[PDB]
Design a protein around this ligand. Sequence first.
Ligand SMILES: Nc1ncnc2c1ncn2[C@@H]1O[C@H](COP(=O)(O)OP(=O)(O)OP(=O)(O)O)[C@@H](O)[C@H]1O
Ligand SMILES: *[C@@H]1O[C@H](CO)[C@@H](O[C@@H]2O[C@H](CO)[C@@H](O)[C@H](O)[C@H]2NC(C)=O)[C@H](O)[C@H]1NC(C)=O
Ligand SMILES: [Ca+2]
Ligand SMILES: [Ca+2]
Lengths: 125, 372, 258
Amino acid sequence: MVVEHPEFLKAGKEPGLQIWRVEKFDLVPVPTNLYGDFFTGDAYVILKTVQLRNGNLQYDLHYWLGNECSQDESGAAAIFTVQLDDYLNGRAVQHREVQGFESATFLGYFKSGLKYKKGGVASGF
Amino acid sequence: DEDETTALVCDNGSGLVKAGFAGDDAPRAVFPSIVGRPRHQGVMVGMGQKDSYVGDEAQSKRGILTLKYPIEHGIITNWDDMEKIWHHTFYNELRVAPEEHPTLLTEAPLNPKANREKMTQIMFETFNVPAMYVAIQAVLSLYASGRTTGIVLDSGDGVTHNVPIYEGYALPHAIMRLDLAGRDLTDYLMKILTERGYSFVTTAEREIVRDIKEKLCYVALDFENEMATAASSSSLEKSYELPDGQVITIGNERFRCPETLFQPSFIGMESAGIHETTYNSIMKCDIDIRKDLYANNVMSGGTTMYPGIADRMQKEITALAPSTMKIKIIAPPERKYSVWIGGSILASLSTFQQMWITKQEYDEAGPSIVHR
Amino acid sequence: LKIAAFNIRTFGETKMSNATLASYIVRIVRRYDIVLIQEVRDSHLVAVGKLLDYLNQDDPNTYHYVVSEPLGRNSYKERYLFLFRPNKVSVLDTYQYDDGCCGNDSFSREPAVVKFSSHSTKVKEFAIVALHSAPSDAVAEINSLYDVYLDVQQKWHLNDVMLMGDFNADCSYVTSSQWSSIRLRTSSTFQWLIPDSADTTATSTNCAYDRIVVAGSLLQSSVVPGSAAPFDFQAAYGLSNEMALAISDHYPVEVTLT
Ligand SMILES: Nc1ncnc2c1ncn2[C@@H]1O[C@H](COP(=O)(O)OP(=O)(O)OP(=O)(O)O)[C@@H](O)[C@H]1O
Ligand SMILES: *[C@@H]1O[C@H](CO)[C@@H](O[C@@H]2O[C@H](CO)[C@@H](O)[C@H](O)[C@H]2NC(C)=O)[C@H](O)[C@H]1NC(C)=O
Ligand SMILES: [Ca+2]
Ligand SMILES: [Ca+2]
C-alpha cells in the first residue's frame, strides 16, 4: 500500500462529502455543484468524512451502483472502495448501495434531494 | 498502453486453465490443464519429434500419451509440468512474449506460503516477466459481482471452497474445503448411467458422458418428491445422440447426479453437503457480520452452472439458518469465469498500477516480497 | 525386408478391445518389418496406443510409428498408420501431401509420404507413398498419384518410391476402359507388383483392390520376384468364414525386398 493517485491524497483530510465516478478503470472527481445526480448506467463511490468529539475522524464508504451499468464499473466500484478503506488504515465501514434501494444513512447525505438520470460513460471492455 | 492493453490475467483451475488480456469480456483462451507424455517413440506426419504436448493436443491424442494433472485439487503439485502449461499459454495460446507483459495469476483459497513464493520465483527468473501479482480465486469472484462482502462458493473441476469475505479481506479461519467437483460427478454419472443399462466403453463414450452432464443434468430441489415425479414415467426424460447414429434416454440419473453435492453419501463420502458447508462456513465467522454473508451468497466456478441450484441452496440454508434471517443466493450467468473476470478488471485498474510487485522489488527482496 | 499394406475395416477402439481379434492383428503385424494400416477410425488414438502396448511390451523399441491427423473431406475421417522396426530400417523424413486444401482438392485423404533408410537392402534410401482411395474417384486419385511421385522428385530427388495401399483399383470402381487415363499405369516409369489377377479381398469376391506400385531402377531390382502377393490369413491360420471376416474384408498385400 504505497498508492499515490491524485484523488487519494485529497480524500479524507477534512469533514465534508466527496464523490468520484468510475470512468473506464479510473476515478474522476464529480463537480461539487452536480452532487446528487447519478447516471443509471454508471457506478459511483462516495466518502462521508464526519468530525468526532475526540478530535479524530470517522469515514463511511458508500458505493452507489447503477441499474443499466456494465460489470467493469460495478466491479471497479467495489475494488476502489476496499483500497481506500486500507489507505485510511482500515478505519472505515463500507456500505453497498443499489439504485432505488438506498440505505438509511446514504439518503441522508443529500440535503438537496436525490435525482437519477438516464445515460453514463461507456464501458472499459 | 504499455500496461493497459499489454496486461495479462490467468485463472489456474484443476480442470481448465483460463487466460486472456486485461480488459476483455471473456478469456481469449480456455484449455484443459493437462500435460501429455508420449508412451511410444514415433512422429506425426509432417512434424518431427515431440518431447511432450500441452492442452488440447494432449487431450485429443490421450490414447498414446500418459497424461499428468499438475493442479491436484486446486493447488499446484507438479511444478515442472505447470511450467510448460504457462509456456503453452504465453507463446502457443495468446501469441505473446512474457518479458514485456505484466502477468496476473490466481491462487486457490488456502495456498501455502511456499506455493505463492515458488510460482513467483518461476515467473520472474524462468520467464523473465516485467511485473506480476498473485490474487485469490474466490476474491476476484466477489469483486466480479461488484461488492466487497459476502460468502463465495467456487466449485470447479477439482475442489469446492466456501470463502467468507469481509471488507475485501478473506477470512481464512472460516474457509471450508470439500474434495468433490466436476470430474467426480461425471465419474458418478458414468457409473449410474452404465448401471441404468447402457455402456460407455470407447473414448467417444467416455468423453461424451461429460458433455451430457453439463447440458442435461439439473439440480432438482426436494429430491424425495422428485423421485415420485420420475416414478410416474413423466416427460422428465431427455434423449441424446452419440457421435454415431445411436440414441440414448436419460431418466432419474439426470438429477441424481448433481444431488451428490447435497448428499455426499451417494458417492460413499461421510462428509457434509454444500448447503451445510455454507452454514458452518458462516458459523465460523464473527456474529456481527453473518447477516451480510447470508444476503451476499455469491456463486462461482463451473460445477455451479446446473439449473435449479440457487433454488436448492436458498431452501436449504433458509431451512437451516434463522427464521428472521434474510438469505439470497446470487449466481451470475458468467460464473464459470467469475475468477478470471474479476482479475481482468483488477489488473486493468489505474490504481492497480502500483500493486505490481516488479522485478525491481524482486531483485532486492527476493521471492519473499509478494508474500505480504 | 518384409513390407505390407493392410486395410483393416473399422479399425477403432471396439475392434482392439476384443481380445480374440486383437490377438491375430498384432500377430499379423509382427510378420512384417514395415506395416501400413488403413481405415484407422480412432478419434483419440487409444486403439493405436493399445496396439503399440502389445507389440512393445517386452522391448519398448520393437516398433516405432508414423501416424497422421484424421483426413477426409467427407466428414468421416480416418488415419494412415505406419508401424516400422527401428533396427531393420529408419525414417528420415515424413510429410502430408498438399493437393490444395476450394473445389480443386484432388484427394479425399491426402497421401502420407515417408522417406526410409534400409541399410540391409540394395536400395539404401527409398520413399513409401501410402493411399486408401475413395471408391468414387478411384481413378481420379490413382491418376493423381503420378503427381505425388513427381513431387517427391522435386523434394528429396529420390526416384526410388513405393506407392502402396487399398487403391480400390479393380472391378466396378476401375474397369478396363478407365486405365487409359491413369498416367500411373500408362507411363513405363512404374511397375505394378500386385497384378490384376490377384484377389485382395477376404470375401469370396475376386478383386485386386490392394496394390503395390514401385518406381525407380534400384528399387525395382531390390524386389524379390514371386514374393509380391497378398496373404490369405483365413487359410493361413485355419480360420472360419465369420472369424476371418470379423477381422477385416481386405487382405494384406505384402512384398519382400533385398
Ligand atoms: N454448464 C455446466 N454445467 C455443469 N457443469 C459444468 C458446466 N460447465 C463446466 N462444468 C464443470 O466444471 C468443471 C470446470 O469448471 P472450472 O473451470 O470452474 O473448474 P477449474 O477452475 O478448472 O477447477 P477448480 O476450480 O476445481 O480447481 C468441469 O469439470 C465441468 O464438468
Ligand atoms: C470378438 O468378436 C468375435 C467375432 O464377432 C466374436 O466371435 C463371435 O461371437 C458371437 C457372439 O458374440 C458368436 O455368435 C459367433 O459364433 C462368434 N464368431 C465365430 C464364427 O466364431 C467373439 O465373441 C468376440 N470375442 C469375445 C471373447 O468377446
Ligand atoms: Ca456505463
Ligand atoms: Ca477455479
